[PDB]
Amino acid sequence: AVNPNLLKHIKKEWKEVLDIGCSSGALGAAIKENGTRVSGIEAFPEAAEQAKEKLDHVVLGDIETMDMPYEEEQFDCVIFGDVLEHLFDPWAVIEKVKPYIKQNGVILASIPNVSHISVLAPLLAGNWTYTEYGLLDKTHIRFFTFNEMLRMFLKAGYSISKVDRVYVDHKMYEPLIEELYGICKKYRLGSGFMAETVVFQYIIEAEKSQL
Amino acid sequence: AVNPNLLKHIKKEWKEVLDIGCSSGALGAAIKENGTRVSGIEAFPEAAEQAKEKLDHVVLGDIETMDMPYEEEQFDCVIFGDVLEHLFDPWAVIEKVKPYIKQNGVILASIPNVSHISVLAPLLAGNWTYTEYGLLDKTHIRFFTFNEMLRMFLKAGYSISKVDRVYVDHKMYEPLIEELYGICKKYRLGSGFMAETVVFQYIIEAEKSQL
Ligand code: NI
Ligand code: NI
Ligand code: NI
Ligand code: NI
């Protein structure tokens, strides 16, 4: 299923895109309508076999350990749509893909926010309940806040070009959110609690750079 | 390195113990001083080779996927000392070991608490920072609160026989803790916030049972 939040960041002029976790290839198929050549990587065979008939090149494999059958500087964009939190070493994976990105190409990543009020309220209630879907999806094994997203990309030698915030309804939580913000201010806990606890996911464009 | 919090729960009268993540075998070696036969499982070869000269039986392998070379009802106790949070499917692993536990035998597990103030305060500050050691150890891929520990064991058909709470210094956090407790009471968020956010780890004895 496409993340509609990602498609709006796809540039029509891109020539080559790599979709990491391409599933059955629906996002790539959409991108291909622009003429862009789309490569995908998928770990589940049934999905990878569907993607093979839609995309230009598909690997059935694990990004964390696979050989990379691409040219240096092949890709305008490498997409991590709701992937990084499923990997054991996401930090290593973003460095691994870097040589395959063009000069001034980008990573486009959608990353769930662990500081979202829907995780923080139950945690205060004494719960960390894994679910079929959502922020505590049972297949999620890594967690990130915005600060940690920024650190991850910056330390891998990417610069942050764009940040898009995806919000969900949180009207019921507002009073709780305002009281918690009072405690952060009082206790000098960070900055941006209010701006960040309402963000469900971040879409980040990170441009290839150096340290 | 031994967890000194575990050794006090070892019964001298036990005849057979399985140490899951036995490392170099130091905990097992201590248990053996009682005459108890100790089996260990370790995933890192260098450690497993040291353990082999100390314990009665050692497997180099991954508990999640290995065949189990033990008899049914072999073990008085299966120890998970600071293991469960490192596994991809800890829920499945506790069911997997169950047939190898004696009637009225136990699992003894030490499990870090994600609701500890040292995780919750930085999370409010906008951080989820993985570390070399501690609650957000970079090799930790699962997180639990006390409620979730209880659910995990109960749903696998164990009964909870004993719970030991391991505390660390938190004097600097007390005012923050008291204010947060006020918010939980006000917002009807669970129960036991104050009792639980000061617990760094839990040691749980779970007795073999049924649903
Ligand atoms: Ni997911
Ligand atoms: Ni709002
Ligand atoms: Ni550990
Ligand atoms: Ni206290």
Side-chain angles (χ1 to χ4, degrees), chain A residues 37 39 41 57-59 66-71 74-75 100:
Chain A
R37 190 172 178 270
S39 299
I41 295 164
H57 184 274
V58 175
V59 174
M66 68 190 261
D67 295 331
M68 296 293 278
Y70 313 113
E71 296 296 335
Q74 186 174 333
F75 297 108
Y100 307 96

Side-chain angles (χ1 to χ4, degrees), chain A residues 120 124-130 138 140 142-143 145 147-148 151 175-176 179 183-184 186-187 189-190, chain B residues 91 120 124-130 138 140 142-143 145 147-148 151 175-176 179 183-184 186-187 189-190:
Chain A
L120 176 64
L124 293 166
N127 298 132
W128 184 276
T129 305
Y130 291 101
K138 60 201 198 167
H140 287 177
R142 294 297 179 190
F143 300 89
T145 68
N147 287 349
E148 310 303 349
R151 293 175 184 126
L176 178 53
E179 306 224 34
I183 290 174
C184 294
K186 178 142 117 151
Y187 285 97
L189 303 170
Chain B
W91 307 271
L120 176 64
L124 293 166
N127 298 132
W128 184 276
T129 305
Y130 291 101
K138 60 201 198 167
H140 287 177
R142 294 297 179 190
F143 300 89
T145 68
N147 287 349
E148 310 303 349
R151 293 175 184 126
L176 178 53
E179 306 224 34
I183 290 174
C184 294
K186 178 142 117 151
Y187 285 97
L189 303 170

Side-chain angles (χ1 to χ4, degrees), chain B residues 29-44:
Chain B
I31 297 171
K32 286 184 52 58
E33 296 181 26
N34 305 322
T36 304
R37 190 172 178 270
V38 183
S39 299
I41 295 164
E42 178 48 41
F44 294 87

Side-chain angles (χ1 to χ4, degrees), chain A residues 96 119 122 190:
Chain A
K96 175 173 182 176
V119 171

